[PDB]
Every structure is written in C-alpha cells, then in structure tokens.
Structure 1
Amino acid sequence: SHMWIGVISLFPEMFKAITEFGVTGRAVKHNLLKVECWNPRDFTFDKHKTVDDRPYGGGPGMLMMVQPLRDAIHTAKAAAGEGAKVIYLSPQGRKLDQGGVTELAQNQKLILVCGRYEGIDERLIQTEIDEEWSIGDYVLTGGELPAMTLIDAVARFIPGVLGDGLLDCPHYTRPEVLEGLTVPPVLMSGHHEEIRKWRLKQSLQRTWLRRPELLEGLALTDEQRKLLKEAQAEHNS
C-alpha cells in the first residue's frame, strides 16, 4: 500500500532532503511514497509574485497572502481526489508523538500546508484545514521542516520502506573494546533469550531514569515488571 502526500510550500526544493536521500528517497524512487508540491508563488497574478500580506491590527510581521495560498490548496485538493486529510502544521496544533504518527499513517492521502512568515489567516484554518498538528513545543522559521518530519515518520509505516513506548536500549558494534570500554559480555554470549531480556531491562531502566513519566502510561507485562524491579534494585545497589 502506497501513500500520497501533497505539500503546499513557498520552498518546494527543501523537500529534496527527503525525496532524494536515504530510506525516504528510496521509498520515493520505488513509488511507495509520492510527494507532490504546489508553490503559492505560482498562483500569484501581480508582477512581483507577492505571497505575503499585512496583518489586520498591525504588528511587526507578515502573514501568508490568502489568495495564492487558497488557490494552491484548492489545486492540491483537486489533485488528491476524495479522502485526503488536509493538515496545517504549527505550534498551536496537536503535539505529535509516535501514537499520533501511527494514526496519521492510516491515511492513504495527506495534504500538508507549510506556513511561512507569522502564519496563515485563521479563516483558512476554519475553511480549508481538517487538523492542526505540531512537531513539538518550539518555534521555527517555517512549516517545511515539520512537514518533512511528519512525512519521514509516517513513511516508516509504508510496507516495503523499512528492511513499544519505552526508550531504546544501548547498541554496540565493533570493536570489542573502544577507549577501554568493553561490550557487555551478554551480547557476545550468543544466548538469544538472555540478550532479549538484557535489552528489555536496559530499555526499562533507561526509561525510568530519563523519562519516568513515560512509564506511568504503560501497562507493563509481568516480565517487564520483574526486569524493572531488578534494574531499580541494582540502581539502589
């Protein structure tokens, strides 16, 4: 099953970062992921191709001009056909987490609207946007990096693109000793079950130490409860 993502952006060439490189680049080349861009600048009619406009009420910044942006959105919606969810990315949106990625990955078509300047007219959010999403509680110069982050995250769910609430365990590769630090012997034991339990215990320990609030949201298995208790006992010596 493939995924189609329409993007509205003043800087469509930024999207080469995901369409030309790495796992996502392969997904695009293999037609597993399609990314199509529309630029509001192409929908302007004045000589200077104006894409910003002044905010009612004054203020230091500018907003995206409504007409070119609205026309670009409508063109993207026509290209998508029916069933495409239109998303605006901003810090005022629902904060993205891996559960939200999983939800968004259920869509076969998405349209991502990338804001620049101080943002977009509130009435376009009311009339054109289905959902507002944020990649995190911080402020950027534009919505393109958030859009690409979202695309990369959801692309991992497309069948063929790739070859539990806890933080990842530590990983080791060659050499066996690096600046005096050795690989945990269990990882060289060849005992698959002991290795699985070590990695799970490490993930539980790391989540407890670094992000204890994430543990509150989990219903730990019996095995996970035991390994977490073991890790906490070792921490308390």
Structure 2
Amino acid sequence: GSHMWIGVISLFPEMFKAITEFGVTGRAVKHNLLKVECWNPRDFTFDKHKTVDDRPYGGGPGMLMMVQPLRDAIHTAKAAAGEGAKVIYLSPQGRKLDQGGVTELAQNQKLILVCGRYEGIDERLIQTEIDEEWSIGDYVLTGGELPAMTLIDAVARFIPGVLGASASFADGLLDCPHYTRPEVLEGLTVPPVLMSGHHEEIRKWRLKQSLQRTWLRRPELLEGLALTDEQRKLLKEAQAEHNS
C-alpha cells in the first residue's frame, strides 16, 4: 500500500543494516513496505585516496564534509528519487523531532536523509540542497546516521502493514504500566483489576495510570492537551489519591 522509499547519503551505509536486517523494520524491508537506498560520498570521489573531508575556512580544529563528493551523492539520490522527494539534513540545529513531527514526515512517500560526519557540512549546501533541517534531540553525536535510523524507524511504524511521546483518547500521554507472567514477582503482585476480566475497569485503570504518570513525570505535556471529561475526572482522582 502506502509504501515508503527513503534515500540515505552516508559514509557508513553498512550502519543501516541495523534497521534493514532486524525486527519489525527488517520485515518491512523484506516485504517491500519500506525501501532504504544508500549512496556513499566516497563513491563520488576522484582522487587516489578517496578524500571525503576538507578543511574549514577560518581555521579552527576539525574537518568538514568535502563539498564535491557530498553534492554529487545528493544529486544522484535526487535523480533516482524522481519528483516529490523531501531532502532532510539531520543535526542539532534542526527542528526538534517529536511524535507530531514523525507523523508529519510520515506523510511523505519519498525522503532523502543526508547524514554528516566530522564537524558538519558547508552552509551553502544546506541552503541549496536541503529542504528541511531536523534534530532527534538536544545532544551531540558523532554522525547523522543514528539520527537518520531513528527517523526511519519512527516513520516506518506508520506504513500500513508494518505493525499489527506526544500527539482511550490517550494520544499525548505517557504509556501505562504493563504486566505479564508470573502473577507474583519478587513479592510484587499484579494489580487485581488486570485479572478481573472487566474490560471497562481495565481500560479506565490504564488511562488513569497514563494520566497520573504524565502528571508526575512530564506535567508540561498535560498543558498541551484538551483533556476529555473522563480524563479530567480520572486525573483528579489520581491527584486526590496522591495527596491522600
């Protein structure tokens, strides 16, 4: 159905095996629901030593991605993608990814993800080749590959058939606690409601737990929500119990 194609520009394409060969995403690739295609700037070099880095104007330590091999790799990916491919640059300077952002990105049938190494890429390439800049969080990594892989995994969950944070009606809340066998573990028992077989009591317990957990751990997330009448009631109950 709404299958997705993701082009990747990376000096380390074999890193992407972590998502293309394993788990739910691996199955998505095998079943042709998701296609990940990689281009390596090293393949676009022409000097004997296949140089992919270059010195920064203005000095300072560190190197940057060499423009020519990276530019040529991007152009080749764009040509293969055809029309409509959104080109994304992953860096801490980008729009912070959240679940709403994931759902926006998942609307695209084609994406090209540019993964930098070293200290960065030329600002003029960002101006001329990149459509959107995204960050997976406020921290610094050794390359854009893990961020790209994270984005791919997050959007892959929205492709029909692949499956069986933020935005019942619990979208926007933290997940509730989960329990499986055994009934008693290190003296700790499963909440009896979960054994009751009472589907409505269980639903309300889970929703109440999610509201309580969000209130205690991430109260700022609650402010972004328009709680339903039921959610307002269950949250009040949790707060009263917490205060008791």
| TM-score, normalising length: structure 1 | 1.00
How far off its partner does 1:19 sit?
A: 0.0
Residue 157 of structure 2 aligns with which residue? 156
> 1-side partners of 2:198 and 2:60: how far apart?
65
> 2-side partners of 1:162 and 1:43: how far apart?
37
How far off its partner does 1:96 sit?
A: 0.1
How far off its partner does 1:53 sit?
A: 0.1
> 2-side partners of 1:165 and 1:49: how far apart?
47
> 2-side partners of 1:96 and 1:165: how far apart?
14
> 2-side partners of 1:131 and 1:176: how far apart?
49
How far off its partner does 1:47 sit?
A: 0.0
Query: Matched residue of 2:37: which SS?
Result: strand
Query: Matched residue of 1:93: which SS?
Result: strand
Query: Matched residue of 2:205: which SS?
Result: helix
> 1-side partners of 2:93 and 2:60: how far apart?
19
> 2-side partners of 1:21 and 1:198: how far apart?
34
% identical aligned pairs:
100
CA deviation digits over 1:107-147, x for unaligned, max 9?
00000000100010000000000000000000000000000
1:19-98 aligned at under 5 Å gives the runs 19-98=20-99
> 2-side partners of 1:122 and 1:217: how far apart?
34
User: Is there any run of 5+ residues in structure 2 with no aligned partner, and where?
Assistant: 165-170
How far off its partner does 1:224 sit?
A: 0.2
> 1-side partners of 2:107 and 2:200: how far apart?
33
How far off its partner does 1:44 sit?
A: 0.0
Query: Matched residue of 2:202: which SS?
Result: helix
How far off its partner does 1:42 sit?
A: 0.1
How far off its partner does 1:48 sit?
A: 0.1
> 2-side partners of 1:229 and 1:46: how far apart?
68
How far off its partner does 1:49 sit?
A: 0.1
Query: Matched residue of 1:100: which SS?
Result: helix
> 2-side partners of 1:100 and 1:59: how far apart?
35
CA deviation digits over 1:185-227, x for unaligned, max 9?
0000000000000000000000000000000000000000000
How far off its partner does 1:70 sit?
A: 0.1
Query: Matched residue of 1:15: which SS?
Result: helix
How far off its partner does 1:74 sit?
A: 0.1
Match of 2:203 among 196, 200, 207: 196
> 2-side partners of 1:220 and 1:59: how far apart?
51
> 2-side partners of 1:193 and 1:160: how far apart?
28
CA deviation digits over 1:138-159, x for unaligned, max 9?
0000000000000000000000
1:88-127 aligned at under 5 Å gives the runs 88-127=89-128
> 2-side partners of 1:201 and 1:43: how far apart?
55
How far off its partner does 1:40 sit?
A: 0.1
How far off its partner does 1:232 sit?
A: 0.1
Query: Matched residue of 2:236: which SS?
Result: helix
How far off its partner does 1:73 sit?
A: 0.1
Query: Matched residue of 2:222: which SS?
Result: helix
How far off its partner does 1:172 sit?
A: 0.1
How far off its partner does 1:31 sit?
A: 0.1
> 1-side partners of 2:15 and 2:153: how far apart?
14
Query: Matched residue of 2:83: which SS?
Result: coil
Query: Matched residue of 1:94: which SS?
Result: strand
> 1-side partners of 2:6 and 2:121: how far apart?
20
> 2-side partners of 1:119 and 1:100: how far apart?
23
| TM-score, normalising length: structure 2 | 0.97
Match of 1:177 among 168, 184, 190: 184
How far off its partner does 1:18 sit?
A: 0.0
Point out 4+ residue stretches in structure 1 off by more than 2 angstroms: none
Query: Matched residue of 2:208: which SS?
Result: helix
How far off its partner does 1:181 sit?
A: 0.2
User: Is there any run of 5+ residues in structure 1 with no aligned partner, and where?
Assistant: none
How far off its partner does 1:89 sit?
A: 0.2
> 2-side partners of 1:85 and 1:8: how far apart?
13
